[PDB]
């Protein structure tokens, strides 16, 4: 019935406006799980839980549930020093796609926290087109060029600006709905 979407959008806003965003562990699996549990707790059965089922989209099969926990252990260890390293890490985290649903919205928040910690920048998502973003994400396992081009064009160092945060959350929620 998906007023689940309306409620989780309210949770995403509450995340920033309470300052709880500042309590989330950055660039780790556990931190991703914190985000997901915050956005979807009480809405999805599985909120914050690593899936035990397999999933694909388009022609892509995400990491097999049978070794997804082992994958995530390696992924969270990845360096975050450069824009390229951070995008490579986001890309592997997306290939893992650790939840049944809500991977995209939770992992974008997770990405911005990593960019903010390490580069003092976040993506100005409001200027990132849905078509170009989805195309880039779908290509990224083979070549993250499209994704690096697109996101690098759209970084901002105004990391706490209300308009960037809230128009960004709206755009993020639009990407998958």
Q: Which helix (H) or strand (E) holds 143?
A: none
Query: Cα–Cα–Cα angle for 142, 84, 72, nearest 5°?
Result: 65
Paired strand residues for 97: none
Distances (CA, A) of 83 to 68, 143, 155: 25, 15, 10
Domains (range + CATH), the chain: 2-177 (1.10.3290.10)
- Cα 36 → chain centroid: 9
Closest Cα partner for 21 from 167, 170, 131, 166? 166
- Give every CB contact of residue 73 below 8 A, 6+ residues apart in sequence: 29
Measured from the Cβ of residue 177, the count of other Cβ atoms closer than 10 Å reads: 9
Nearest to 163 by CA among 114, 111, 120, 126: 126
Resolution of the experimentally solved model in angstroms: 2.2
Work out the angle between the directed axes of helices 29-40 and 68-77 (0-180°, nearest 10): 110
């Amino acid at each position: 019935m998906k007023s689940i979407d309306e409620q989780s959008l309210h949770n995403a806003r509450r995340l920033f406006e309470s300052g709880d965003i500042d309590r989330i562990e950055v660039g780790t699996t556990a931190g991703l799980q914190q985000i997901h549990r915050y956005l979807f707790g009480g809405l999805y059965d599985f909120a914050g839980q690593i899936r035990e089922d397999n999933i694909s989209k388009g022609g892509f099969r995400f990491a097999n549930a049978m070794y997804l926990k082992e994958a995530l252990v390696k992924i969270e260890q990845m360096p975050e020093r450069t824009f390229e390293e951070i995008i490579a890490k986001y890309v592997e985290m997306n290939i893992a796609h650790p939840f049944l649903e809500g991977n995209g919205r939770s992992t974008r928040i997770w990405l911005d926290l990593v960019l903010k910690k390490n580069l003092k920048k976040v993506v100005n998502w409001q200027n990132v087109s849905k078509t170009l973003y989805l195309q880039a994400m779908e290509r990224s396992p083979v070549n993250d060029l499209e994704l690096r081009f697109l996101l690098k064009d759209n970084l901002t160092d105004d990391v706490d600006n209300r308009e960037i945060i809230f128009k960004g959350i709206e755009q993020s929620y639009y990407y998958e709905g």
